[PDB]
Amino acid sequence: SMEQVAMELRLTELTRLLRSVLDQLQDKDPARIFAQPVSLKEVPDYLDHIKHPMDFATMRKRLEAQGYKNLHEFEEDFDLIIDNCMKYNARDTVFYRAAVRLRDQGGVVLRQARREVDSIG
């Protein structure tokens, strides 16, 4: 149908905007602490602590398969990255502090993304 196509164009354009958002968020992680899944070879107990692991590479895979239907779903995954870290790692660690800084800096980016998604529809 013509409508399914229109719908698919909207999803493609959302994917386009979310790809830009993801790049901007990932620039706020210059140490690459959040770039890849926590290694279960190196942290074998991790899943006993964290039930829904997340990381930027995993978000990117989902993004490129057009697997985010709306900004809320994307934000959910970004918040997992931060929240998983702040639970597993103590306050006085480079990991926890990195997540606080990513949260604070990403807020600005996400605030305008929400306006852009509402604005462009």
Swiss-Prot record:
Crosslink site: Glycyl lysine isopeptide (Lys-Gly) (interchain with G-Cter in SUMO2):
41
Q: Where is the Bromo domain?
A: 9-113
Q: Where in the cell is it found?
A: Nucleus; Chromosome
Tissues expressing the protein: Highly expressed in testis.
Taxonomically, the superkingdom here is Eukaryota
Known partners and oligomeric status: Component of some HBO1 complex composed of KAT7/HBO1, MEAF6, ING4 and BRD1/BRPF2. Component of the MOZ/MORF complex composed at least of ING5, KAT6A, KAT6B, MEAF6 and one of BRPF1, BRD1/BRPF2 and BRPF3. Interacts (via PHD-type zinc finger domain) with unmodified histone H3. Interacts (via PWWP domain) with dimethylated and trimethylated 'Lys-79' on histone H3.
Could you tell me what this protein does?
Scaffold subunit of various histone acetyltransferase (HAT) complexes, such as the MOZ/MORF and HBO1 complexes, that acts as a regulator of hematopoiesis. Plays a key role in HBO1 complex by directing KAT7/HBO1 specificity towards histone H3 'Lys-14' acetylation (H3K14ac), thereby promoting erythroid differentiation.
Q: List the protein's name.
A: Bromodomain-containing protein 1
**Species this chain originates from:** Homo sapiens
